[PDB]
Amino acid sequence: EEDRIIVSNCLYEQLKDKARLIAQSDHFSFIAIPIDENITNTLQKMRPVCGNYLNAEPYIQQTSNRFLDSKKLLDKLTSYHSIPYPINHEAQVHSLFEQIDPAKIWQTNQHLTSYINRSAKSRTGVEAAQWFKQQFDTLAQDYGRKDVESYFVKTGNKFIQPSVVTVIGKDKPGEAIVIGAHIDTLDGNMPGADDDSSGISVELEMARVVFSSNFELNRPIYFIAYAAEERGLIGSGYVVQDFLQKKIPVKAVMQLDQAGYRANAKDQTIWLLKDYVDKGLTEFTAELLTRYVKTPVGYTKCGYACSDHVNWTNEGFKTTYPSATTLDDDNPYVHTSNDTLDILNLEHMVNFTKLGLAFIVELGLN
Template sequence: MKSLLSTLLLLFAIVSVGYARPIATSEIAAKSAQGLRLLSLAEGEDPVWKTEAEVLDLLRAGKNFFDVTDTYELETKLRAQTGSAAKVVSDVLRATYAAPSKQTQVRAILGTLTTTNMQSYLNTLTAFNNRYYRSTTGVSASNWILSTVQGFATQYGRSDVVAQQVTHSFQQPSVVVRIPGSNPSAPRVLLGSHMDSINLSNPTNGRAPGADDDGTGAVNLLEAYRALLQGNFRPTNPVEFHWYAGEEAGLLGSQAIAANYKSTGVQVKAHLNLDMTGYYKPGTAEVMALAPDYADSGLNEFMKLLITAYSRIPWANDLACGYACSDHASWNRQGFPTAYPFEAVTGNDNPTIHSASDTTSVNGFSWTHSLEFAKIAAAFAYELGI
């Protein structure tokens, strides 16, 4: 009964997306200029203005939110065009996918994934003092990711692959790489992680290696992308890899990209979010935990089949992730099917994140565990892209 009630409340909140007090463009411009941020703190509630100090207080208290300062007007326009969110609810609940069927081709690619490569990538990312979205080192991290993915395309002779940065209102750009499909108009298959890191004690200057949050997800995608190019992956559907900026400050990069895709009519077949994949509490079962909320139920069923087919560790149902807990929520917010496999059942996950202690030396960090998520990323791209 509790599960059914929660689902009904969520559907009601999604349908009731109209704001009681629409915010004028002039107000957004004026308050943004004052350094205020517009935050959506809960389903069905109007967003509220907060100072930077109040934003940090929310983060330190573990309160998740969407920072909608940059996307509020676009989302309001989208709601006005559609009239209601009923179609969004329908789309989110009814995505269906064929069972994995390309084991021979996929396993050949998975065999080329290595923890050595992922360790090398992560050594570079964690060497930045932090990857905070408003720091120069956050920009440097984005530049390094762009250069790396461009280098893989050159290495494997893939001049058709397009890699670019997506600029935002803040310093750190997101990175998007597209492997074109033989059917350019087919719905896109998307895989995302966030590149930024944060030290909640001193966000701008504090040491934030972000090895697990989200260095692991970022390097999973780098290695999956590299292996697919090495395997001469030429999909039918366009396949994109995304590294999002500003996740730690309210899902900024993923929101901007998801809202842009919605407003420009981009069709999305599925979106996979990898955020923390390298840790499980010593003494607990090693699993891939699937977030049940703000994710597509049909895509989660596909993920169970995918994990069973291609991973040595089993899937598990996670506890509720909560409002705006990671970048998959940005895609769910726009009605796109998304899934979020997590490193462990919530409670058995990494306790050192958002601090200088988020390194690979923490007891419980496992490269072989993280490798399983890179396998699932490559398999996801192949099975849904071909």
């Protein structure tokens, strides 16, 4: 019934009267509040000022408050401590670039954005997840790759939309590489074109290029579609917990959230996030952009519980997050009916696909 979530004190003061305060710090509150869509609307409306929220359930799973060290939980999920990469595979990286099929990218966006919404509560939201899984399965069957796996990861008992985890090279030795994007959107009429149809499309193309590649990787590569990112990042919460339980070792994580909108349609700058990411992995991404994508490299900052990468870094995994926009010249249309297909820049997505593939090759073959 009640959600337990972590919010900025800013957001708390807007929710006080409907919430139970469990623990509090100078900047954040750990609360219990039954999220109805009245409260959903408050969360959405205060998000630019007060930041996003983190659903704690994947970290504490129904454990009673009496048994929780609430303050340690609150401190460790609102702070982070920081934790060299070779680039020596130019021939392979260019081979993969030459196989990028921009039309196939665009087609994916057309499909996801044709749904009325992809909400974690709705039937269409469930279809989108099932669709994604089947796109992977089909691709692996089409290129006769047995070397693979795909499964749903339940979004607890709160949301019917599951996450989808896929992997190429299940039997490869070593720490894996993870690529992720979130499949979901808000309720109502939400094409969610830039708000991660884009990210999803980019990684789907990355997967397909990898299947059609002439060389194998020396590590497993995961491609993930997170459920319910628009619900306090709870989908990737469960996914990270699933990786922890299965003891899957992971060397690097890329988050693709909004990979398709340009503020100025011939800007071509790609922005890297500098908080809640690995600085080492981020400098690496910067040099891939300069060396291979030949793009200007910008930097930006994010609010609290910005996106799924946060669940990885909270659990000690190294994380990088390339983004379409800076925090000041934004996508003004995200979370509205106007996050439409026609807002997407295909050159921009192609560049994120390039970045992703260089990432996969230079880590995948060390």
